[PDB]
Design a protein around this ligand. Structure first.
Ligand SMILES: CN(C)[C@@H]1C(O)=C(C(N)=O)C(=O)[C@@]2(O)C(O)=C3C(=O)c4c(O)cccc4[C@@](C)(O)[C@H]3C[C@@H]12
Ligand SMILES: [K+]
Ligand SMILES: [K+]
Ligand SMILES: [K+]
Ligand SMILES: [K+]
Ligand SMILES: [K+]
Ligand SMILES: [K+]
Ligand SMILES: [K+]
Ligand SMILES: [Mg+2]
Ligand SMILES: [Mg+2]
Ligand SMILES: [Mg+2]
Ligand SMILES: [Mg+2]
Ligand SMILES: [Mg+2]
Ligand SMILES: [Mg+2]
Ligand SMILES: [Mg+2]
Ligand SMILES: [Mg+2]
Ligand SMILES: [Mg+2]
Ligand SMILES: [Mg+2]
Ligand SMILES: [Mg+2]
Ligand SMILES: [Mg+2]
Ligand SMILES: [Mg+2]
Ligand SMILES: [Mg+2]
Ligand SMILES: [Mg+2]
Ligand SMILES: [Mg+2]
Ligand SMILES: [Mg+2]
Ligand SMILES: [Mg+2]
Ligand SMILES: [Mg+2]
Lengths: 88, 101, 55, 64, 117
RNA sequence: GCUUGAGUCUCGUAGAGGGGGGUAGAAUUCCAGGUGUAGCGGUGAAAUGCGUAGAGAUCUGGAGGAAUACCGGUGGCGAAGGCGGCCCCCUGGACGAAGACUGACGCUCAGGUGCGAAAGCGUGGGGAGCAAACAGGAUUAGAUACCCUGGUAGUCCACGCCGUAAACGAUGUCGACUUGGAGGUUGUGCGCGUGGCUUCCGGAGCUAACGCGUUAAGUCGACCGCCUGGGGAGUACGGCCGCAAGGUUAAAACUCAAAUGAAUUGACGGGGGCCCGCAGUCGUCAGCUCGUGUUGUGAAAUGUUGGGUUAAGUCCCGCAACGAGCGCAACAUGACGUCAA
């Protein structure tokens, strides 16, 4: 999983504060960081199906949070996907 | 850094080579900004069963804080040293300083 | 199961000490268990059955 | 259970004097139903014994 | 005909037969007998009595070596585990040790399939 | 807008969760050599087989593969399939404590997509043990079997395919609510609490019954999947998928008046326990019944079972049964019935 330090950085960049761990932007940024990190794992470990199920849950959760944010605030949504480099 | 507990046991004829090996292996670790929390030379003990005809071996314990690569490097040294008949490297959660049984 | 026959001990006492060491170690039951292959399904069924009658 | 009573956290593979209480003379690990070890400590004990056996601090069997 | 004060009796007690082999303590065989080669075939071969007679005849086979004391290595589950050792005692050997040496795999190889009798 | 559903963060906990790499000890087989000598092996009994060209046994050295005794547990983990020596590397989930944070972001899900035991298939490796096929030996009326001696695919590894199993709790997922008892396992607060997971018993209720019973098959709500007599048939045709084996979707004509579930009384078993007998009929065997009560929706059950004891349902003691009749016994005598004898 993501380190305490790497997590704390992401909360600082995308959150309102260090305490603001709940915001959709932070949550999406955290999921994105771990999805990107795990690409190296699954490149090496192609038949780690059990861990991949956890990755696909991260992907699905991110998709649901982005869809929530899109319909709640299109502008924040647009900013976020630019910063994180997501298609949608 | 990660905390490791290392046991290795040396061929009883190379018991006199062990002080040089200990100071060499600790030199490898200290050079990587690593720490030595414990270092016990248990000396020649009776083996519970024969390992490669031998009935005794010279045990050395050391608890170490280091990067994983220098530990990986130290395991390859044990592999390719015929004096080192057997070794075990174990992750520990915390540092261990206090003396063993 | 390894008995050293102790001094001024008769042979029956030596031999029953060997018998008791064997039954404690469980040699013959382990041999009889390993004579034939038991499918894992059969093993689990046996384990469950023993448990249901233990309780 | 001694390990619970005596406040033990991690059973040490190096503590051969302790481990010898939980093996038979054949070298086999004694069941928890005999010794009254708690399940959590029985698992630690089994691991400790298997490490000790690897390092030839304990025998696997009474006939090497 | 060399003298061999101390020896080892190896008892191979299978379900079908008993082989008694007396060796020196290097494991060089000095003499042997079997339940099958002692006037017992089929059902009688796999009995404690046939194992007794095998042990008696093995003691006769090693008469000239002057073996006085024996260790006993017992191997297998068969009917001639105990009766063999009693016979070696009756033959006038000093039994010093008794050891079970039955092979037990620590898992090992898949055994043959169960018989559907 | 809100924080109660859902989610994020912090600290910690247990775990055969997964992927990769390394390594240990036991054992089997094989090879080489020593000692030793007539058997070994196998079965119900044998024989095939192995062995004087020195087996089997025993000791020493070596090679190689596969699986990890004990621990071990109605134990643990995983969506399911499944996962078990030890060590390291990479990695998924769960749970608890105390807050902080987001602010309905949720539940379910046709089509879709992924994962999916074993066998099987492709290419390349590997091959100890085991073992479809196959061969021989037995058994038998025969024995294309069961048993024995061998033994190839396969079982193992890499990568790809297959997509099925009594893939089962034969029980879809999510949420709420509704008496108890005894355990297991794993957290945590001060003997006493409080969470998670799990096993057994049982209450109301439910159920055709069996049973289920806060882990519901109870009481409700949301959404999905599926059924509509037995066969024909999960078959044909068509489509799609597959290297193939085949999978998946899925009819009709025709045919029967049943098929089926659970439970009841018998009878029967090459099921178990306990007894008896020189081991017209069954059989002089000790049985067979009824009234009333009670239990069950009901067929029925109880009594008549049970602990003892007896030649005996003989007698005693217990018991939702309480009594009674025909038998037993007592004073040759054949209970209710059976064989359309
Ligand atoms: C008209 N309708 C579309 C029918 C239908 O609903 C079918 C179904 N499975 O529900 C068919 O299979 C149906 O579509 C269909 O395919 C039919 C058939 O294939 C055949 C064939 O091939 C040969 C004989 C009879 C039939 C059949 C009577 O079963 C056909 C019925 C078809
Ligand atoms: K080495
Ligand atoms: K949907
Ligand atoms: K083969
Ligand atoms: K009923
Ligand atoms: K559904
Ligand atoms: K019909
Ligand atoms: K009645
Ligand atoms: Mg066999
Ligand atoms: Mg983990
Ligand atoms: Mg692999
Ligand atoms: Mg397979
Ligand atoms: Mg293949
Ligand atoms: Mg075979
Ligand atoms: Mg066969
Ligand atoms: Mg199916
Ligand atoms: Mg299953
Ligand atoms: Mg099951
Ligand atoms: Mg089903
Ligand atoms: Mg679970
Ligand atoms: Mg119940
Ligand atoms: Mg079909
Ligand atoms: Mg088709
Ligand atoms: Mg009656
Ligand atoms: Mg009467
Ligand atoms: Mg009564
Ligand atoms: Mg009368």
């Amino acid at each position: 999983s993501l380190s305490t330090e790497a997590t704390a950085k992401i909360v600082s960049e995308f959150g309102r504060d260090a305490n603001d761990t709940g915001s959709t932007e932070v949550q999406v940024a955290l999921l994105t960081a771990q999805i990107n990190h795990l690409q190296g794992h699954f490149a090496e470990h192609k038949k780690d199906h059990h861990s991949r199920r956890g990755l696909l849950r991260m992907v699905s959760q991110r998709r649901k949070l982005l869809d929530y944010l899109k319909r709640k605030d299109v502008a924040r949504y647009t900013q976020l996907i630019e910063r994180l480099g997501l298609r949608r | 850094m990660r905390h490791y507990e290392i046991v290795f046991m040396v061929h009883p004829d190379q018991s006199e080579q062990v002080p040089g090996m200990i100071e060499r292996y600790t030199a490898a670790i200290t050079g990587a900004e690593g720490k030595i929390h414990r270092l016990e030379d248990w000396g020649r003990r009776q083996l519970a069963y024969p390992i490669n005809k031998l009935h005794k071996a010279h045990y050395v314990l050391m608890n170490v804080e280091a990067p994983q690569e220098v530990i990986d490097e130290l395991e390859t040294t044990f592999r390719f040293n015929d004096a080192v008949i057997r070794s075990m490297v174990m992750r520990t959660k915390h540092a261990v300083t206090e003396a063993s049984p | 199961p390894v008995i050293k026959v102790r001094e001024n001990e008769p042979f029956d006492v030596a031999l029953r000490r060997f018998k008791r060491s064997c039954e404690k170690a469980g040699v013959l039951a382990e041999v009889r268990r390993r004579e034939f292959y038991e499918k894992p399904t059969t093993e689990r069924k046996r384990a469950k059955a023993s448990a249901v009658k233990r309780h | 259970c001694r390990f619970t009573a005596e406040g033990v956290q991690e059973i040490d593979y190096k503590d051969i004097a302790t481990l010898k209480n939980y093996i038979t003379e054949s070298g086999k690990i004694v069941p928890s139903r005999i010794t009254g070890t708690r399940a959590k400590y029985q698992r630690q004990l089994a691991r400790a014994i298997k490490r000790a056996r690897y390092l030839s601090l304990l025998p696997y069997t009474d006939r090497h | 005909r060399k003298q061999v004060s101390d020896g080892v009796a190896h008892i191979h007690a299978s379900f079908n037969n008993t082989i008694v082999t007396i060796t020196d303590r290097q494991g060089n065989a000095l003499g042997w007998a079997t339940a099958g080669g002692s006037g017992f075939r089929g059902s009688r071969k796999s009995t404690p009595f046939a194992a007794q007679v095998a042990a008696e005849r093995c003691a006769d086979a090693v008469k000239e070596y002057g073996i006085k004391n024996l260790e006993v290595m017992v191997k297998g589950p068969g009917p001639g585990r105990e009766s063999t050792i009693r016979a070696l005692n009756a033959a006038g050997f000093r039994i010093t040790n008794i050891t079970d040496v039955t092979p037990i795999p620590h898992x090992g190889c898949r055994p043959p399939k169960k018989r559907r009798v």
